[PDB]
Coordinates of C-alpha atoms and ligand atoms in Angstrom, one line a residue:
Chain A
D270 CA 12.0 44.4 -42.6
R271 CA 14.8 46.6 -41.3
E272 CA 16.7 44.1 -43.7
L273 CA 14.8 45.5 -46.7
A274 CA 15.5 49.2 -45.6
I275 CA 19.3 48.3 -45.3
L276 CA 19.2 46.8 -48.8
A277 CA 17.2 49.7 -50.3
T278 CA 19.6 52.2 -48.7
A279 CA 22.8 50.4 -50.0
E280 CA 21.3 50.3 -53.6
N281 CA 20.4 54.0 -53.3
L282 CA 23.9 55.0 -52.1
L283 CA 25.7 52.8 -54.7
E284 CA 24.1 55.0 -57.4
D285 CA 26.0 58.0 -55.9
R286 CA 29.3 56.3 -55.0
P287 CA 31.4 53.1 -54.7
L288 CA 31.1 50.7 -51.7
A289 CA 34.5 51.9 -50.4
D290 CA 32.9 55.4 -49.8
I291 CA 29.8 53.9 -48.0
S292 CA 30.1 53.4 -44.2
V293 CA 27.9 50.9 -42.2
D294 CA 26.9 54.2 -40.6
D295 CA 25.4 55.6 -43.8
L296 CA 23.6 52.2 -44.2
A297 CA 22.3 52.3 -40.6
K298 CA 21.3 56.0 -40.9
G299 CA 19.5 55.3 -44.2
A300 CA 17.6 52.3 -42.6
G301 CA 16.5 54.2 -39.4
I302 CA 18.6 51.8 -37.1
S303 CA 21.8 52.1 -35.1
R304 CA 25.2 50.7 -36.2
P305 CA 25.1 47.7 -33.7
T306 CA 21.5 47.0 -35.0
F307 CA 23.0 46.8 -38.5
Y308 CA 25.4 44.1 -37.4
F309 CA 22.4 42.0 -36.2
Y310 CA 21.3 41.7 -40.0
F311 CA 24.7 41.8 -41.8
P312 CA 28.3 41.2 -40.8
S313 CA 29.8 43.8 -43.3
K314 CA 28.8 46.3 -46.0
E315 CA 30.4 43.6 -48.4
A316 CA 27.6 41.2 -47.2
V317 CA 24.9 43.7 -48.1
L318 CA 26.3 43.9 -51.7
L319 CA 26.4 40.1 -51.9
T320 CA 22.7 39.9 -50.9
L321 CA 21.8 42.7 -53.4
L322 CA 23.6 40.9 -56.2
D323 CA 22.0 37.5 -55.2
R324 CA 18.5 39.1 -55.5
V325 CA 19.3 40.6 -59.0
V326 CA 20.9 37.4 -60.5
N327 CA 17.9 35.4 -59.1
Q328 CA 15.4 37.9 -60.6
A329 CA 17.1 37.5 -64.0
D330 CA 17.2 33.7 -63.5
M331 CA 13.5 33.5 -62.6
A332 CA 12.6 35.7 -65.7
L333 CA 14.6 33.4 -67.9
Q334 CA 12.8 30.3 -66.4
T335 CA 9.4 32.0 -67.1
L336 CA 10.4 32.5 -70.8
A337 CA 11.6 28.9 -71.0
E338 CA 7.9 27.9 -70.0
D339 CA 10.6 33.4 -85.0
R340 CA 14.3 32.4 -84.1
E341 CA 15.7 36.0 -84.0
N342 CA 12.8 37.1 -81.7
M343 CA 13.3 34.0 -79.4
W344 CA 17.0 35.0 -78.7
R345 CA 16.1 38.7 -78.5
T346 CA 13.6 38.1 -75.7
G347 CA 16.1 35.9 -73.8
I348 CA 19.0 38.5 -74.1
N349 CA 16.4 41.2 -73.2
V350 CA 15.8 39.5 -69.8
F351 CA 19.4 40.3 -68.9
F352 CA 19.5 43.8 -70.6
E353 CA 16.4 44.9 -68.6
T354 CA 17.1 43.1 -65.3
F355 CA 20.8 44.3 -65.0
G356 CA 20.0 47.6 -66.8
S357 CA 17.3 48.2 -64.1
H358 CA 20.0 47.6 -61.4
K359 CA 23.2 49.3 -62.9
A360 CA 24.7 50.4 -59.5
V361 CA 24.4 46.9 -58.0
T362 CA 25.6 45.2 -61.2
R363 CA 28.7 47.5 -61.5
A364 CA 29.6 47.1 -57.7
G365 CA 28.9 43.4 -57.9
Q366 CA 31.1 42.9 -61.0
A367 CA 34.0 44.9 -59.2
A368 CA 33.6 42.8 -56.0
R369 CA 34.3 39.5 -58.0
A370 CA 38.0 40.5 -57.7
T371 CA 38.0 40.8 -53.9
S372 CA 35.1 38.5 -52.7
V373 CA 35.2 34.7 -53.2
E374 CA 31.5 34.6 -52.4
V375 CA 30.7 37.2 -55.1
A376 CA 33.0 35.4 -57.6
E377 CA 31.4 32.0 -56.9
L378 CA 27.8 33.4 -57.1
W379 CA 28.6 35.0 -60.5
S380 CA 30.3 31.8 -61.7
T381 CA 27.4 29.5 -60.6
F382 CA 24.8 31.6 -62.5
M383 CA 27.0 31.9 -65.7
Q384 CA 27.4 28.1 -65.7
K385 CA 23.6 27.7 -65.4
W386 CA 22.9 30.3 -68.2
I387 CA 25.6 28.8 -70.5
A388 CA 24.1 25.3 -69.9
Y389 CA 20.6 26.6 -70.8
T390 CA 21.9 28.4 -73.9
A391 CA 23.7 25.1 -75.0
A392 CA 20.5 23.1 -74.4
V393 CA 18.5 25.5 -76.7
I394 CA 21.2 25.4 -79.4
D395 CA 21.2 21.5 -79.1
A396 CA 17.3 21.5 -79.5
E397 CA 17.6 23.9 -82.5
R398 CA 20.2 21.5 -84.1
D399 CA 17.9 18.4 -83.3
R400 CA 14.9 20.0 -85.0
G401 CA 17.1 20.8 -88.1
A402 CA 16.7 24.6 -87.6
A403 CA 20.5 25.1 -86.8
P404 CA 23.7 23.6 -88.3
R405 CA 26.1 21.3 -86.3
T406 CA 29.1 23.7 -86.3
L407 CA 31.0 24.4 -83.1
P408 CA 30.4 22.3 -79.9
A409 CA 27.2 24.0 -78.5
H410 CA 28.6 24.4 -75.0
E411 CA 31.8 26.2 -76.3
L412 CA 29.7 28.5 -78.6
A413 CA 27.3 29.2 -75.6
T414 CA 30.3 30.0 -73.3
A415 CA 31.8 32.6 -75.8
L416 CA 28.4 34.2 -76.5
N417 CA 27.5 34.5 -72.8
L418 CA 30.9 36.0 -72.0
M419 CA 30.4 38.4 -74.9
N420 CA 27.1 39.5 -73.3
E421 CA 28.6 39.8 -69.8
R422 CA 31.4 42.1 -71.0
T423 CA 29.4 44.1 -73.6
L424 CA 26.3 44.7 -71.3
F425 CA 28.5 45.8 -68.4
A426 CA 30.7 48.0 -70.5
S427 CA 27.6 49.7 -71.9
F428 CA 25.9 50.2 -68.5
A429 CA 29.2 51.7 -67.1
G430 CA 29.6 53.9 -70.2
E431 CA 33.2 52.5 -70.6
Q432 CA 35.4 53.6 -73.4
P433 CA 35.1 51.5 -75.5
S434 CA 31.5 50.4 -75.3
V435 CA 28.4 49.8 -77.5
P436 CA 25.9 52.6 -76.8
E437 CA 23.2 51.3 -74.5
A438 CA 20.5 52.0 -77.1
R439 CA 22.4 49.8 -79.7
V440 CA 23.6 46.9 -77.4
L441 CA 20.5 44.6 -77.7
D442 CA 20.5 44.7 -81.5
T443 CA 24.3 44.3 -81.7
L444 CA 24.2 41.1 -79.5
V445 CA 21.1 39.6 -81.2
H446 CA 22.9 39.9 -84.6
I447 CA 26.0 38.1 -83.4
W448 CA 24.0 35.4 -81.6
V449 CA 21.7 34.7 -84.5
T450 CA 24.4 34.7 -87.2
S451 CA 26.8 32.5 -85.1
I452 CA 24.0 30.0 -84.1
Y453 CA 22.3 29.7 -87.5
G454 CA 25.3 30.4 -89.8
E455 CA 27.0 27.6 -91.7
Chain B
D105 CA 69.8 47.4 -68.3
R106 CA 69.1 47.0 -64.6
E107 CA 65.6 48.1 -65.9
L108 CA 65.4 44.9 -68.1
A109 CA 66.4 42.7 -65.0
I110 CA 63.7 44.4 -62.9
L111 CA 61.1 43.8 -65.6
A112 CA 62.2 40.1 -66.1
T113 CA 62.1 39.6 -62.3
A114 CA 58.6 41.0 -62.0
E115 CA 57.3 38.9 -64.9
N116 CA 59.0 35.8 -63.4
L117 CA 57.4 36.4 -59.9
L118 CA 53.9 37.3 -61.3
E119 CA 53.8 33.6 -62.6
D120 CA 54.2 32.5 -59.0
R121 CA 52.0 35.1 -57.2
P122 CA 49.9 38.3 -57.4
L123 CA 51.5 41.8 -57.3
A124 CA 50.2 42.3 -53.7
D125 CA 52.6 39.4 -52.6
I126 CA 55.6 40.8 -54.4
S127 CA 57.7 43.4 -52.5
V128 CA 60.1 46.0 -54.2
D129 CA 62.6 43.9 -52.2
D130 CA 61.9 40.7 -54.1
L131 CA 62.2 42.8 -57.3
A132 CA 65.5 44.5 -56.2
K133 CA 66.9 41.1 -55.0
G134 CA 65.9 39.5 -58.4
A135 CA 67.6 42.3 -60.4
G136 CA 70.9 42.2 -58.3
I137 CA 70.3 45.8 -57.1
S138 CA 69.4 47.5 -53.7
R139 CA 65.9 48.8 -52.8
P140 CA 66.9 52.5 -53.2
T141 CA 68.5 51.6 -56.6
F142 CA 65.1 50.1 -57.6
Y143 CA 63.5 53.5 -56.9
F144 CA 65.9 55.2 -59.4
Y145 CA 64.2 53.1 -62.2
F146 CA 60.5 52.9 -61.0
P147 CA 58.5 54.8 -58.4
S148 CA 56.4 51.6 -57.4
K149 CA 55.9 47.9 -58.1
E150 CA 52.6 49.1 -59.8
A151 CA 54.8 51.2 -62.2
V152 CA 56.8 48.0 -63.1
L153 CA 53.5 46.2 -64.1
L154 CA 52.3 49.3 -66.2
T155 CA 55.6 49.0 -68.1
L156 CA 55.3 45.2 -68.5
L157 CA 51.7 45.7 -69.8
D158 CA 52.8 48.6 -72.2
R159 CA 55.4 46.3 -73.8
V160 CA 53.0 43.3 -74.3
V161 CA 50.1 45.5 -75.7
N162 CA 52.7 47.3 -78.1
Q163 CA 54.1 43.8 -79.1
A164 CA 50.5 42.7 -80.1
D165 CA 49.9 46.1 -81.8
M166 CA 53.2 45.9 -83.8
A167 CA 52.4 42.3 -84.9
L168 CA 48.9 43.4 -86.0
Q169 CA 50.5 46.3 -88.0
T170 CA 52.9 43.7 -89.7
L171 CA 49.9 41.6 -90.8
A172 CA 48.0 44.7 -92.1
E173 CA 51.1 45.2 -94.4
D174 CA 40.6 33.3 -97.7
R175 CA 38.3 35.4 -95.4
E176 CA 38.2 32.9 -92.5
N177 CA 42.0 32.6 -92.5
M178 CA 42.5 36.4 -92.6
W179 CA 40.5 36.8 -89.4
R180 CA 42.1 33.7 -87.8
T181 CA 45.6 35.1 -88.3
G182 CA 44.5 38.5 -86.8
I183 CA 42.9 36.9 -83.7
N184 CA 45.9 34.6 -83.4
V185 CA 48.2 37.7 -82.9
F186 CA 46.3 38.3 -79.6
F187 CA 46.0 34.6 -78.7
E188 CA 49.8 34.1 -79.1
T189 CA 51.0 37.4 -77.7
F190 CA 48.8 37.5 -74.6
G191 CA 49.0 33.7 -74.3
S192 CA 52.8 34.0 -74.2
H193 CA 52.5 36.6 -71.3
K194 CA 49.6 35.2 -69.2
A195 CA 51.0 36.4 -65.8
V196 CA 51.4 40.0 -67.1
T197 CA 48.0 39.9 -68.9
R198 CA 46.2 38.6 -65.8
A199 CA 47.9 41.1 -63.4
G200 CA 47.4 43.9 -65.9
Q201 CA 43.7 43.1 -66.4
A202 CA 43.2 43.1 -62.5
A203 CA 45.1 46.5 -62.2
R204 CA 42.5 48.2 -64.6
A205 CA 40.3 48.4 -61.5
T206 CA 42.9 50.2 -59.2
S207 CA 45.2 52.0 -61.7
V208 CA 43.9 54.9 -64.0
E209 CA 47.2 54.6 -66.0
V210 CA 46.5 50.8 -66.6
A211 CA 42.8 51.5 -67.4
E212 CA 43.7 54.3 -69.9
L213 CA 46.4 52.1 -71.6
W214 CA 44.0 49.2 -72.1
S215 CA 41.2 51.6 -73.3
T216 CA 43.6 53.4 -75.8
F217 CA 44.6 50.1 -77.4
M218 CA 41.1 48.6 -77.5
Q219 CA 39.9 51.8 -79.3
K220 CA 42.7 51.4 -81.8
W221 CA 42.0 47.6 -82.4
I222 CA 38.2 48.2 -82.7
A223 CA 38.9 51.0 -85.2
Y224 CA 41.1 48.7 -87.3
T225 CA 38.5 45.9 -87.1
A226 CA 35.7 48.3 -88.3
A227 CA 38.0 49.6 -91.1
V228 CA 38.5 46.0 -92.4
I229 CA 34.8 45.2 -92.1
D230 CA 34.1 48.5 -94.1
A231 CA 36.7 47.4 -96.7
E232 CA 35.0 44.0 -97.0
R233 CA 31.6 45.6 -97.4
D234 CA 33.0 48.1 -100.1
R235 CA 34.4 45.2 -102.2
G236 CA 31.0 43.4 -101.9
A237 CA 32.5 40.4 -99.8
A238 CA 30.4 41.3 -96.7
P239 CA 26.7 42.5 -96.2
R240 CA 25.8 45.9 -94.8
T241 CA 24.2 44.7 -91.6
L242 CA 25.1 46.3 -88.2
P243 CA 27.1 49.5 -88.0
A244 CA 30.7 48.2 -88.5
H245 CA 32.1 50.1 -85.4
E246 CA 29.3 48.7 -83.1
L247 CA 29.9 45.1 -84.5
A248 CA 33.7 45.5 -84.1
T249 CA 33.2 46.8 -80.5
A250 CA 31.2 43.7 -79.4
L251 CA 33.5 41.2 -81.1
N252 CA 36.6 42.8 -79.6
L253 CA 35.0 42.9 -76.1
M254 CA 34.1 39.2 -76.7
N255 CA 37.8 38.4 -77.5
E256 CA 39.0 40.4 -74.4
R257 CA 36.7 38.5 -72.0
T258 CA 37.0 35.1 -73.7
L259 CA 40.8 35.0 -74.1
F260 CA 41.4 36.2 -70.5
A261 CA 38.9 33.8 -69.0
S262 CA 40.6 30.9 -70.9
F263 CA 44.1 32.0 -69.9
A264 CA 43.1 32.3 -66.2
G265 CA 41.2 28.9 -66.4
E266 CA 38.1 30.7 -65.0
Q267 CA 34.8 28.8 -64.5
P268 CA 33.3 29.3 -67.0
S269 CA 35.7 29.4 -69.8
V270 CA 36.4 28.0 -73.3
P271 CA 39.3 25.5 -73.1
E272 CA 42.5 27.3 -74.3
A273 CA 42.9 24.7 -77.0
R274 CA 39.4 25.5 -78.4
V275 CA 39.3 29.3 -77.9
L276 CA 40.8 30.4 -81.3
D277 CA 38.4 28.2 -83.4
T278 CA 35.4 29.4 -81.2
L279 CA 36.2 33.1 -81.7
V280 CA 36.9 32.7 -85.5
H281 CA 33.5 31.0 -86.0
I282 CA 31.6 33.8 -84.3
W283 CA 33.7 36.6 -86.1
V284 CA 33.2 35.1 -89.6
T285 CA 29.5 34.2 -89.2
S286 CA 28.7 37.7 -87.7
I287 CA 30.8 39.6 -90.3
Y288 CA 29.7 37.6 -93.5
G289 CA 26.2 36.4 -92.3
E290 CA 23.1 38.2 -93.8
Ligands
GH5_722 O1 22.7 37.2 -71.9 C1 22.6 36.2 -71.3 C2 23.4 36.1 -70.0 C3 23.9 37.6 -69.8 C4 25.0 37.5 -68.8 F1 24.4 37.2 -67.6 F2 25.7 38.5 -68.8 F3 25.7 36.5 -69.2 N1 21.7 35.1 -71.9 C5 21.8 33.8 -71.2 C6 20.5 33.0 -71.5 C7 20.2 33.1 -73.0 C8 19.1 32.2 -73.3 N2 17.9 32.5 -73.8 C9 17.1 31.4 -73.9 C10 15.7 31.4 -74.3 C11 15.0 30.2 -74.1 C12 13.6 30.1 -74.4 C13 13.0 31.1 -75.0 C14 13.7 32.3 -75.2 C15 15.0 32.4 -74.9 N3 17.9 30.5 -73.5 O2 19.1 30.9 -73.1 C16 19.9 34.5 -73.3 C17 21.1 35.3 -73.2
GH5_723 O1 41.3 40.0 -80.8 C1 41.6 41.1 -81.1 C2 41.8 42.1 -80.0 C3 41.9 41.1 -78.7 C4 41.8 41.9 -77.5 F1 42.9 42.6 -77.4 F2 41.5 41.3 -76.4 F3 40.8 42.7 -77.7 N1 41.6 41.5 -82.5 C5 41.6 42.9 -82.9 C6 42.1 43.1 -84.3 C7 41.4 42.2 -85.2 C8 41.9 42.5 -86.6 N2 42.5 41.7 -87.4 C9 42.7 42.3 -88.6 C10 43.4 41.8 -89.8 C11 43.8 42.7 -90.8 C12 44.6 42.3 -91.9 C13 44.9 41.0 -92.1 C14 44.5 40.1 -91.1 C15 43.8 40.5 -90.0 N3 42.2 43.5 -88.4 O2 41.7 43.6 -87.2 C16 41.8 40.8 -84.9 C17 41.2 40.5 -83.5

């Protein structure tokens, strides 16, 4: 509604600058509403970012669910959900990652979804071991945890152009290599 | 001197609480000096953390240099330098990681050492490929980047007891598995 215009404005401004340099006034002005009208839809600019991040993590989650309904290509398509979804929302991903430090709600959102994505990873590794396609090496949930944390750090360093980082055009191939060798390697 | 007592005090208090809840007064009081005497040695409590982190990253770096003067055990000993060094300084590591967001000096320190550690990793992978012990798969510097970023995120999640995290007692074996399979796996 006006809610969607507030969310579009905040995502648009986050591309230009950090949430510290965005006023509820910029957000109201972008959405064609007054400041007190903003406060009807959101308590803070921090609450706007939480909603933007909730939409992006659920978009990734729903795409992974769709997939779940050649072993290298299987993992590549799964990693690609996160590459494309977060890569299509870099400003929100970057701001949301930074807000984990200062928002308990943002930290718990991120934590909830990582636990879900790790549990799905471990379940697929377990299924691969059960069909005899993968060796019983590390505990599957521990392997999944380290690989998902690798993806989190690597994808977000690439998207931010951090030094150091894998170039964005090389990051999917890099991560697929490490997943497939670590999951199938004896 | 008095400098060492300020640094010992700050590391001691960081174990109890975050740098936000430590006053220059706590630091002065711990070191048996006055507040203005503190300002003779350090401009801010933020400068104390920068020095503490510089000492820890250089301790790791010097231990790695010592090492550099069975392939699974080679990588295990190298990863162990970082596990033991950072694991022996969890309060400083945790505070230092958080300060990357709000200190350019802390972010550039961390960046400098990651670039060095990635370049050393890539050089060892290159040497392993040159002696025919490792296959020419991914670009060595891209593989090294992702593996080092994996270690950074995984070690620091374990030490902080984040949810999710690999249990501290399982994190070295977890990371050695993923390094050896990804470096030696075809
Ligand atoms: O990368 C992230 C999370 C990234 C983040 F958010 F930063 F951590 N992944 C988490 C989920 C992984 C997965 N794929 C499949 C699958 C199942 C069926 C068919 C195809 C694939 N199951 O689990 C892909 C990689
Ligand atoms: O884990 C980190 C960095 C961790 C951080 F800081 F979080 F990123 N490592 C970076 C350095 C790696 C390495 N080991 C050896 C070696 C050489 C000779 C003999 C034995 C080992 N060469 O490179 C070990 C893992």
